[PDB]
Amino acid sequence: AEGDDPAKAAFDSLQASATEYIGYAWAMVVVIVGATIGIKLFKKFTSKAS
Amino acid sequence: AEGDDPAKAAFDSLQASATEYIGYAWAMVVVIVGATIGIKLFKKFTSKAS
Amino acid sequence: AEGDDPAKAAFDSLQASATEYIGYAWAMVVVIVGATIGIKLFKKFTSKAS
Amino acid sequence: AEGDDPAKAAFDSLQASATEYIGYAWAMVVVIVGATIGIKLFKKFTSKAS
Amino acid sequence: AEGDDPAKAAFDSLQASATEYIGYAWAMVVVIVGATIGIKLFKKFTSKAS
Amino acid sequence: AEGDDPAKAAFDSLQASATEYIGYAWAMVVVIVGATIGIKLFKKFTSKAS
Amino acid sequence: AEGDDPAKAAFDSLQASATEYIGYAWAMVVVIVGATIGIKLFKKFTSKAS
Amino acid sequence: AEGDDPAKAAFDSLQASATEYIGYAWAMVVVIVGATIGIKLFKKFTSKAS
Amino acid sequence: AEGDDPAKAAFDSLQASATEYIGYAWAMVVVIVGATIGIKLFKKFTSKAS
Amino acid sequence: AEGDDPAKAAFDSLQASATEYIGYAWAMVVVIVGATIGIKLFKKFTSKAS
Amino acid sequence: AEGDDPAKAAFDSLQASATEYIGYAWAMVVVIVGATIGIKLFKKFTSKAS
Amino acid sequence: AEGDDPAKAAFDSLQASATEYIGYAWAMVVVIVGATIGIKLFKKFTSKAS
Amino acid sequence: AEGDDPAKAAFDSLQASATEYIGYAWAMVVVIVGATIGIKLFKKFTSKAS
Amino acid sequence: AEGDDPAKAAFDSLQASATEYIGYAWAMVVVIVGATIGIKLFKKFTSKAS
Amino acid sequence: AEGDDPAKAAFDSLQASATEYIGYAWAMVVVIVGATIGIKLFKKFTSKAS
């Protein structure tokens, strides 16, 4: 009880920290995919011209 | 929820971007086809003369 | 039982999230294909003229 | 005998739990593949038009 | 058995979905070809006149 | 011997399961190709008319 | 000598067991590849028609 | 040796299967070309008349 | 908090770095596509002449 | 030295095995290409007739 | 910063390299098209004579 | 304090060492990608010619 | 310092090795493309004759 | 050095092999084009008669 | 000094052993790639014919 309470809180802290890092992963990939959709659209135009 | 929201928006952004690139493809081909109709009309005149 | 329940729900959440992202993929491609049908129709006209 | 019995049962419990999580994996992928068949069919139409 | 059943059904669903998209491809092309027969018939008349 | 027997059988089960999924892949593609032969035949008619 | 003999034999047993599992892997993949050759042949026909 | 033998045979099976699918491709095209020779002969008559 | 702060910043740095590399990908492809439009236009002229 | 010798030989065995599988790949494709040359020749005749 | 600088430059190098290869593609096609205009002009003379 | 100081410095040393190895990774890949852009440009020319 | 020096050099060695293999890739493709330009030129002649 | 030497040679072997296959492609097409020139010459005679 | 000397030598032995195994990996892949260049050349011929 008394000893694990500082620890549980320490864990809530760590988990939220983790959520933070995770929000950043989602965004990172938002960029990466935004890149892929656009670049693949350029290849699509190549086709219309062909 | 919280982490995927920046990502969903990032995606709306990417999709609209894509629409942009696509509007440009349509126009590009407008030019290409405008070219083909006109040039084929010249061949048509060749025929009337023949 | 008790520990995996928050987890099962967490998973239902993730799966539905995934369905969301998937609905967006279908639409994205709706746009891409809508583009291809139209642009290929322009090439079709090129042919009628030819 | 006496000490491992609560444990064997605990294990049957865990294994069934695992089957549960596994049924969910199959479904998750059902969705993912359902997505791939449909989206690849759209590319197929692109071809018929081409 | 138990885990793959939701999945098999999920697949039947996807396949039928696919048949749907396919019926649409056939029709799309019905239009495209209907276009080609008619337009080529116009060129045929051009010939009779010539 | 004794421990791997439930496992070997479990594997025969899995493999047969796999054959099932595979029979479905063959059919799926039967549909996809049936689509391609027919649609390409429509393009063939376009040619006869041309 | 005396203590490791039951063990060496136990190991020969395990290794042969392993060969068994391995023969099954080869076959499993025989099926998977048999699938790929055939399915890719269907795509080949698609091409001849095209 | 022992594990790859079921596999080699599995492969001979797959290859022969493939030959089957291939014989069908040849025939399919026999039909398609038979179509083209005949239809182009009709255009030939058009010319004799012209 | 204190230990992950140098790390978060390190990540912002990395992400921006990534945006840089990405801007370069877009341009690279600008060149590649610019190439395809122009070269396909040359084939278009071939047609007008034909 | 003594322990790796059974292993080196085991490897020579595996590599030769691999050469076997590879000879089969070459042949498989011999068939596939033989198919493509012939089928494309049929399309060539279509042209002579046209 | 420090590690990606040799890399950015390496990329500028690669891109310029690419421009080089691209200038060569344009020329290659200059030749190919120069060929088509001239050869199609010969067919044009055939017509004047006819 | 006194014992960990030689160690902290030892670590700064190791980290910088690591940066070194990392700068080399970036360059290595600069080469690999430079290779891919150029080689893919050659395939691009193949297309213009086609 | 002392332990990583044999290693850095070992790496320079490996990288140069890699450049070697890469020069060979460029050439390999030189051949492949040389093949494509020439073979596509033969198809070009087919056209002039047509 | 020592390990990549058997490999470099193995590659020279493969490349030369490739040249072989390539010489065969050139010839194959020699036949195909020889076919097209001759067959198109027959159509030319058709014209002289017309 | 005295105890680690048999060990250092034992290590030189092991490392050289390792070089041996490594030379074999290079060759193994020589075969695998030799396979890929040749097989991809066959696909190249398919194209020339097409």
Side-chain angles (χ1 to χ4, degrees), chain C residues 32-48:
Chain C
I32 298 179
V33 167
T36 307
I37 291 176
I39 297 178
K40 292 305 303 182
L41 272 187
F42 275 68
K43 283 294 186 61
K44 294 302 178 181
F45 277 60
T46 287
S47 297
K48 308 312 168 192

Side-chain angles (χ1 to χ4, degrees), chain L residues 3-18, chain M residues 1 4:
Chain L
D4 44 87
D5 282 301
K8 282 179 63 178
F11 264 146
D12 266 299
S13 297
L14 294 177
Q15 189 173 123
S17 296
Chain M
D4 44 87

Side-chain angles (χ1 to χ4, degrees), chain I residues 21-46:
Chain I
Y21 286 102
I22 264 143
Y24 281 129
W26 245 290
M28 199 171 87
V29 190
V30 155
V31 176
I32 298 179
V33 167
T36 307
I37 291 176
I39 297 178
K40 292 305 303 182
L41 272 187
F42 275 68
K43 283 294 186 61
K44 294 302 178 181
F45 277 60
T46 287

